[PDB]
Design a protein around this ligand. Structure first.
Ligand code: ZN
Ligand code: ZN
Ligand code: ZN
Ligand code: ZN
Ligand code: ZN
Lengths: 97, 252, 53, 209, 155, 36, 114, 142, 46
RNA sequence: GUAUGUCUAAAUGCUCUUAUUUACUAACAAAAU
């Protein structure tokens, strides 16, 4: 399990995380992938967390896309990615509450 | 009239004063009392208690002995010692302020060292360099559980909470900034107010979201970075001048 | 060949303070205390060091 | 080697005997964040709460202040105020930085003004100069609410906006109000023209944002 | 008390009479000796104070029966002393003049204290009160931090 | 590169650490002397 | 605390099978582990030119690549891998495949061997 | 000057018990004290070990100093003996051991460690109350 | 006013010199008086 | 010797597959009869 990722997703760590989730309510919304279809999330806190995560992602995307080699295609691709992120964020701002 | 109003206080009994931390992290660090191996959680949670001062305020073991400094816990609204507390339980009156006005430079009305530099977030116990009586209120969205209220209503609510807590100089709610500036007469009073209203809900019993006030995040009450718009500045200058004049008079 | 000078043993110095006081204890009890206290010390230090894992 | 503690007369107390303990490199000074000896005294034996020194002697010397009170050694005024007065007749800029503050503390220049306060010559002169220099109901028509409240009390919840200049006092009792009216700055119930105009303008201002 | 290990003989004559009195104490002690999650310094101190008081009380009871009332045999008293029940030093102090009402021994360790003196408890309420009156303020101290002892003095 | 030579050393005095160095431990308290 | 640590501490209730099951349940949800292009450190055997900016990355030069499994195996039961690299100057994704028929590699729309 | 106050063991016990679940801003300084105490923990260990009750002894009472913070506890007394007497005692114990060996088909040797790594060592207050500690090693006299 | 200084015996467990924490400190030279640096009085070879 | 750095506003249970590993790390060391 060299290079840290393996360590992170080693069974023991996972178990610990699960335990934390069970007792006290420590989740790491960084750690899990954000769900595709909203309205399968009855809790508000979770939703908020997800929204926050997406915002963070968007910010990250923004930070990188103004790099100096602007003509490279990665940046262009991200522009679409950025849009997608924005859309997701908007969706997360649903009007149930 | 806190003296003849009552003696007793007993705000939150020592059966249930507080649980110690709130789980961020995986493991609990014994030396810092803070959860480690992770940081996911906005952390600020609403006070389970509050200072309903007219009911609570009273004579203490401190009052008799001649204590200067007021009870932080009382302010917060959770002083389980109550009548046997050594720190004072009332809203800082003028006489009291006058009495501890010598010390009020170096340390707060709670008897705890004011710092030389402000905290970067203006978040707690103000500096001894800059005297202040002026509190930033914030997180009013969060403190009211994202309620669609009128700004005016919010302002009124703020006034209600803060007037009770100390002699007000002046208050401003702002729609654009989404905040509530308050200014007091005495720094001590302001400090007390801050202590009280840190992590407090602005909601009332009559509101429909009273039972879920705990689930939100409280008021973010902090110190006021001076207002830049010019009239205010001018006023401040005038005040300073007046103070200087007074000092001069005292001297001669 | 031992110290000519040093009368002042460790315990004596401690006694001379106000922070220590002294009891008579069952030896097993004392041992238990040591185990607990010692354990606490090692945890506390470890936690300070930051390594909570 | 160590220099002595600079504690003022009002700081220390009113008695002809005080006992204090020195704690060498006790705490870091609040200004400089640099180890120094804490003196802490109890004033009168039985009077509660100690008085610990919060600053290093050097820093005190530089500012010319009580090591407890944080006030001018001479005139017993907050550093700002004392310095401000001097300026009126230049003020200190404590540099709020981790490293730089320490450096500032170690410098021995008497920062700003302190010199004047120290010397009988200079302080006295400044003082002289200063002397010379010296020688329910809505409410309409800036001043603080704690004054307004006081006034009301004298006359016998009190909302007042300043951008509006529109103070809606609510005693919540017909007795208090009817006493208040007889015992007596426009004050109706729930150059007059000029005043009205000004009020209107204020209201407009309040309402545009 | 210590634990019996056939070192000293089980008990002398009159132990059966007093035992039920000083066995109430044991229960109290047991209640005391545990995690009362005090969550607060003063509260924590209070339990210690209580414990101290309890300790004192048993000794007093023993002392009272042996010296003042004199209803217990010397041998029994000696046995008790040998066991952890009574405090020997405390008893001795009590027997001496001016120390009869005495909260605990470490309230009269003059070496311990920051100011070279005895605990305040040892000042008779009278004197402190008088001082307060002279000053302007009310009665200044309630109980010391060693042991809860509101007016320990022999008066 | 940063694999670099040098211009001057240093000597700046801070607050002492209070660490129990092994060598610093006492040893040869008695100084000898000459005959005169 | 030391790389050759014999036994990792387990909680007093740690049903190992149960724990494993739990992990599995929380592996589909998991971000890492449920993804492709897992990282790797590799030297470059081909010694090739980055097709965009013509940067001549030579033999044995070390990179933090991404190894990903190609679903279409060679023959039947011997896997082949895509090994992503970036050129030092321009950030163009070079990669290559390991077709084991010739005991060597194949370039994959990154650069050219020379 | 005036000697130390012989405190009650109860107080000490209480102090110890308090600093088990220690995680408030209350006893910040107690944690510091505890940390400091590592300095003398080996000394403490040495003391306690030295006072080990000998096999002719059910349970030794022992003098104890302890920091009022609850950070460290030294067995204070240093165990001295009448040398010949001590030797005699040891001999007796040896004899007893030999006898035991002779007797027993299997001698139930301890398992180590005696308590589990999970299980936190019982407080002394679980077995003050327990029955008279079983008889120690002293041979049949005449 | 006359005043008695004392030194209280701190507990032997707690850090003796709780002030100090191995802080870096740049010092000013503070040389107010000016040192006179006095002195007296083929380039292609050298 | 398992490198590193920036970046952070305050669906539920279910079972079935194994005589393995898309395993990762190379700082460590390098010869014949
Ligand atoms: Zn209180
Ligand atoms: Zn002063
Ligand atoms: Zn007493
Ligand atoms: Zn006492
Ligand atoms: Zn006392």
């Amino acid at each position: 399990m060299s290079r840290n990722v393996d360590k992170a997703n080693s069974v023991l760590v996972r178990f610990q995380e699960q335990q934390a989730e069970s007792a006290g309510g420590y989740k790491d919304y960084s750690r899990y992938q954000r769900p595709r279809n909203v309205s399968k999330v009855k809790s508000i806190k979770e939703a908020n967390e997800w929204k926050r995560q997406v915002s963070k992602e968007i910010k990250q995307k923004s930070t990188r896309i103004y790099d100096p080699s602007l003509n490279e295609m990665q940046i262009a691709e991200l522009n679409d990615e950025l849009n997608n992120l924005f859309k997701e964020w908007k969706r997360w701002q649903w009007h149930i509450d | 009239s806190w003296r003849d109003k009552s003696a007793k206080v007993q705000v939150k009994e020592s059966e249930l004063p507080s649980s110690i931390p709130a789980q961020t992290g995986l493991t609990f660090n014994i030396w810092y009392n803070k959860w480690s191996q992770g940081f996911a959680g906005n952390t600020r949670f609403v006070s389970p208690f509050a200072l309903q001062p007219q009911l609570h305020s009273g004579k203490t073991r401190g009052d008799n002995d001649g204590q200067l400094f007021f009870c932080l816990f009382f302010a917060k609204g959770m002083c389980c010692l109550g009548p046997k507390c050594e720190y004072l339980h009332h809203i800082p009156d003028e006489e009291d302020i006058g009495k501890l006005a010598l010390r009020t430079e170096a340390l707060d009305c709670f008897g705890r060292e004011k710092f030389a530099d402000y905290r970067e977030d203006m978040g707690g116990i103000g500096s001894f360099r800059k005297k202040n009586k002026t509190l930033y209120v914030g997180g009013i969205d969060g403190a009211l559980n994202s309620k669609h209220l009128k700004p005016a209503q919010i302002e009124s609510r703020i006034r209600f909470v803060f007037s009770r807590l100390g002699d007000i100089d002046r208050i401003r709610y702002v729609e654009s900034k989404n905040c509530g500036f308050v200014k007091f007469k005495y720094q001590a009073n302001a400090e007390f107010a801050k202590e009280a209203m840190s992590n407090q809900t602005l909601l009332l019993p009559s509101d429909k979201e009273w039972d879920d006030r705990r689930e939100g995040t409280g008021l973010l009450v902090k110190w006021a970075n001076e207002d830049p718009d010019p009239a205010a500045q001018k006023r401040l200058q005038e005040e300073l001048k007046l103070e200087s004049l007074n000092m001069m008079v005292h001297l001669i | 060949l031992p110290t000519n000078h040093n009368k002042t043993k460790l315990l004596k110095s401690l006694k001379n303070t106000k922070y220590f006081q002294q009891t008579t204890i069952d030896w097993v009890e004392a041992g238990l205390q040591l185990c607990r206290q010692g354990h606490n010390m090692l945890n506390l230090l470890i936690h300070r060091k930051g390594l909570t894992y | 080697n160590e220099p002595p503690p600079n504690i003022c007369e009002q700081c220390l107390g009113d008695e002809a005997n005080i006992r204090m303990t020195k704690i060498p490199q006790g705490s870091e000074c609040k200004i400089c964040t640099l180890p120094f000896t804490l003196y802490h005294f109890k004033t009168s034996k039985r009077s509660n709460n100690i008085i610990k020194t919060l600053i290093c002697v050097r820093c005190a010397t530089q500012r010319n202040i009580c090591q407890c009170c944080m006030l001018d050694s001479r005139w017993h005024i907050p550093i700002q105020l004392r310095d401000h007065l001097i300026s009126l007749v230049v003020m200190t800029e404590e540099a709020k930085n981790d490293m730089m503050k320490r450096f500032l503390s170690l410098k021995n220049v008497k920062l700003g003004g302190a010199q004047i306060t120290s010397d009988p010559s200079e302080a006295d002169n400044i003082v002289d100069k200063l002397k010379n220099i010296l020688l329910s109901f809505f409410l309409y028509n800036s001043i603080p609410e704690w004054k307004i409240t006081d006034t009301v009390s004298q006359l016998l919840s009190l909302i007042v906006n300043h951008k509006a200049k529109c103070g809606g006092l609510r005693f919540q009792s017909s007795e208090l109000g009817e006493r208040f009216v007889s015992k007596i700055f426009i004050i109706p119930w729930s150059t007059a023209e000029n005043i009205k105009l000004s009020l209107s303008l204020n209201k407009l201002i309040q309402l545009e944002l | 008390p210590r634990i019996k290990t056939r070192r000293s003989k089980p008990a002398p004559d009159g132990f059966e009479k007093i035992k039920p009195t000083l066995t109430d104490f044991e229960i109290q002690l047991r209640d005391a000796q545990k995690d009362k999650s005090s969550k607060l310094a003063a509260k924590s101190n209070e339990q210690l104070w209580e414990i101290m008081q309890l300790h004192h009380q048993r000794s007093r009871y023993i002392y009272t029966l042996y010296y003042k009332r004199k209803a217990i045999s010397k041998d029994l008293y000696d046995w008790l002393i040998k066991e952890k029940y009574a405090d020997k030093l405390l008893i001795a102090k009590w027997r001496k003049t001016g120390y009869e009402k005495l909260c605990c021994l470490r309230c009269i360790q003059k070496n311990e204290t920051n100011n070279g003196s005895t605990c305040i408890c040892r000042v008779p309420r009278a004197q402190l009160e008088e001082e307060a009156r002279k000053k302007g303020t009310q009665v200044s101290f309630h109980q010391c931090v060693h042991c809860g002892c509101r007016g320990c003095a022999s008066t | 590169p940063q694999l670099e030579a040098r211009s001057g050393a240093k000597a700046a005095a801070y607050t002492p650490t209070g660490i129990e160095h092994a060598r610093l431990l006492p040893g040869h308290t008695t100084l000898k002397y000459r005959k005169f | 605390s030391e790389r050759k640590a014999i036994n990792k501490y387990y909680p007093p209730d740690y049903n190992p099978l149960e724990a494993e099951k739990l992990s599995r349940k929380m592996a589909k949800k998991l971000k890492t582990m449920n993804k492709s292009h897992a990282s790797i450190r590799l030297m470059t055997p081909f010694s090739m030119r980055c097709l965009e900016c013509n940067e001549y990355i030579p033999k044995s030069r070390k990179f933090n690549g991404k190894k990903e499994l190609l679903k279409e195996k060679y023959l039947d039961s011997i896997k082949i891998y895509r090994l992503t690299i970036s050129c030092p100057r321009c950030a163009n994704s070079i990669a290559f495949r390991t077709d084991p028929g010739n005991s060597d590699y194949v370039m994959e729309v990154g650069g050219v061997r020379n | 000057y005036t000697p130390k106050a012989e405190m009650p063991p109860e107080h000490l016990r209480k102090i110890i018990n308090t600093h088990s679940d220690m995680a408030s801003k209350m006893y910040n300084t107690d944690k510091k004290a505890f940390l400091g105490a590592l300095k003398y923990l080996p000394h403490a260990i040495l003391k306690l070990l030295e006072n080990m009750p000998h096999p002719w002894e059910q349970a030794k009472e022992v003098k104890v100093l302890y920091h009022t913070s609850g950070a460290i506890t030294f067995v204070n007394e240093t165990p001295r003996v009448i040398e010949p007497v001590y030797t005699a005692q040891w001999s007796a114990t040896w004899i007893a051991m030999r006898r035991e060996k002779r007797d027993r088909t299997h001698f139930k040797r301890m398992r180590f460690p005696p308590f589990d790594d999970d299980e936190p060592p019982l407080s002394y207050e679980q077995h003050i109350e327990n029955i008279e500690p079983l008889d120690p090693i002293n041979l049949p006299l005449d | 006013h006359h005043i008695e200084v004392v030194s209280k015996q701190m507990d032997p467990l707690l850090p003796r010199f709780v002030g100090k924490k191995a802080r870096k400190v740049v010092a000013p030279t503070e040389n107010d008086e000016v040192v006179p640096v006095l002195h007296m009085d083929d380039p292609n070879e050298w």
